[PDB]
Amino acid sequence: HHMNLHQTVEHEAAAAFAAAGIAGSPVVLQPTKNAEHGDFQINGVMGAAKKAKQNPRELAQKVADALAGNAVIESAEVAGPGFINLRLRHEFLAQNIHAALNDARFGVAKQPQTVVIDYSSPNLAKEMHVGHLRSSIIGDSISRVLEFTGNTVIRQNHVGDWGTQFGMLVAYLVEQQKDNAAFELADLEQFYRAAKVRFDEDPAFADTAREYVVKLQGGDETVLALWKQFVDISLSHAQAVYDTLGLKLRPEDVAGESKYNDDLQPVADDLVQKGLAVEDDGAKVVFLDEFKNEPAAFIVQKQGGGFLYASTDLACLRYRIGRLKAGRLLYVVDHRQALHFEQLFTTSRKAGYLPEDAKAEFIGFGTMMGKDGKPFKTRSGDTVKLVDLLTEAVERATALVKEKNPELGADEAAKIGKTVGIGAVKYADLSKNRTSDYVFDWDAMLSFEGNTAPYLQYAYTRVQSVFRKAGEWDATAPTVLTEPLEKQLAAELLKFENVLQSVADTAYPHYLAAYLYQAATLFSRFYEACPILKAEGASRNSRLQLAKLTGNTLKQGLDLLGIDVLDVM
Numbered sequence: 001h002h003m004n005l006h007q008t009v010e011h012e013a014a015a016a017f018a019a020a021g022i023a024g025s026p027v028v029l030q031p032t033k034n035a036e037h038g039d040f041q042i043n044g045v046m047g048a049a050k051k052a053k054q055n056p057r058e059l060a061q062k063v064a065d066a067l068a069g070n071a072v073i074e075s076a077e078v079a080g081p082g083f084i085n086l087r088l089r090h091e092f093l094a095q096n097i098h099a100a101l102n103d104a105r106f107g108v109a110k111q112p113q114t115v116v117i118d119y120s121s122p123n124l125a126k127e128m129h130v131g132h133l134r135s136s137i138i139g140d141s142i143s144r145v146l147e148f149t150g151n152t153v154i155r156q157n158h159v160g161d162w163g164t165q166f167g168m169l170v171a172y173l174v175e176q177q178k179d180n181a182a183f184e185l186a187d188l189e190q191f192y193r194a195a196k197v198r199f200d201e202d203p204a205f206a207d208t209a210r211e212y213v214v215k216l217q218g219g220d221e222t223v224l225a226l227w228k229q230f231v232d233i234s235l236s237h238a239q240a241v242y243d244t245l246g247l248k249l250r251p252e253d254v255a256g257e258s259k260y261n262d263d264l265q266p267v268a269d270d271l272v273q274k275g276l277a278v279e280d281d282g283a284k285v286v287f288l289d290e291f292k293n294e295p296a297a298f299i300v301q302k303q304g305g306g307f308l309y310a311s312t313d314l315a316c317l318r319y320r321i322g323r324l325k326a327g328r329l330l331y332v333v334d335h336r337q338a339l340h341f342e343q344l345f346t347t348s349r350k351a352g353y354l355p356e357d358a359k360a361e362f363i364g365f366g367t368m369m370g371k372d373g374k375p376f377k378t379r380s381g382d383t384v385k386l387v388d389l390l391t392e393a394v395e396r397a398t399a400l401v402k403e404k405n406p407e408l409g410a411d412e413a414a415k416i417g418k419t420v421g422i423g424a425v426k427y428a429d430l431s432k433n434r435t436s437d438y439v440f441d442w443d444a445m446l447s448f449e450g451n452t453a454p455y456l457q458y459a460y461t462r463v464q465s466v467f468r469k470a471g472e473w474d475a476t477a478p479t480v481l482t483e484p485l486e487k488q489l490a491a492e493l494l495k496f497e498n499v500l501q502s503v504a505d506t507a508y509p510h511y512l513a514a515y516l517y518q519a520a521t522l523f524s525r526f527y528e529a530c531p532i533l534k535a536e537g538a539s540r541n542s543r544l545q546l547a548k549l550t551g552n553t554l555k556q557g558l559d560l561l562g563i564d565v566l567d568v569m
């Protein structure tokens, strides 16, 4: 009870191949670029013709002939040397639109892999930065799509909660609490800088900080409780941003780097025992011929015993495979760490930590930039505060929403403004290929036309306005499709499952954003060309069915991007 449109069409094409004497040859079915050519294109004829050295044009026409009268495909036309353009039959479209609305068991079908997805994952010594913002948003949408397609999704927020820098942070916290028992740590950036001033200016403070590191590494209960105080504060700052954004990431999903500290020396010793890590001036180093320039050096323990980012991620991968029983690992991380994860994966495969049938994927994203192409900063050049950025998005959207509808009350406008403003923060990121650098732009992201969250949100509200106007209708009535844009919109709506499965496979949410924008703009063309309220009979009811499924698909698709809709704006 679903529609995998690609598979349904491929099945008919495969039968036509068999009827044409090329049974078992790959169909190589692809969607069409322009719907003026049809809905799908068969690309496999040239390859199939190679075996018998057959004439490919004649073979393509034989396949097309075998599709005459097909229930799914109403026309099959040869193009180029031996491509075949397929147009879906309107009765097939109508029946499956009807089913998507009325079959109570209809859904997006689901191979329940266990997927551990690592995202957001801020360093706790400072505030969350705009790179962590990208990871939070991109990872949250991927995680939503994976759940919706039936995977077992384990979110892990790999917070940076351990390291020598916490020595000066703990020492500075102690000083600040001695001078005020009501001490509030408002800004982690200012706190961090102030502690470094003390560490750089005061040798007695630096000695004190180094002693706290000793006690932290030693597990001193008293110093660990001070560490936990700081970590809990920093986590609360992150959680307030998560709450504002409306993520699916929860406190129970936190799994900080400190979790793996007892595994670091076992991993290092294991790699030495397997001959993968070797001694290099007292350090333990993994040399990888795979990353030669001379093989790349992947240091797993320093000369004096200290561990590294690489050490923690090796231990953590072992845990995610061996204890969480993950079949697929996704790391949603700034693109500048690509080499770290490539070396992590290669080392883990050689060590047996990552089995041959497990997948591990670096889900990289580009740098957030200002309009000058330089990394994103405030007008005065300072680090962007995420809480300020999100407040600004909501304030900006609230002003625009009041401009568009001056009859909104202040409280109604503010509620709409939150949905539009946060929605735009997410969509302006997610609608771009994650791997590109991203220029932040208030004017672009808050435009009510073009490819933006407000455009799609207001598109949903316009669908709801149609139903406020239409009166009684019957979603269960037989569906008829007679006009070109009726049929084009139906075919687009039936692609939803395939789009979502593509995002699950590739971890590119911008494919879903692109689909929703195409669907909304096509709905608008349909609405102009095929009057709904002026229609009568089956035409009226079928156009209302199309509008209802459009609304449902916009709402569901936006939800999987983390974006909400409103019945009224």
Ligand SMILES: NC(=[NH2+])NCCC[C@H](N)C(=O)O
Binding pocket: 118, 121, 122, 123, 158, 159, 160, 313, 316, 331, 333
């Ligand atoms: N398993 C991981 N290494 N996840 C990413 C951690 C990102 C790191 N905390 C940073 O701020 O850059």
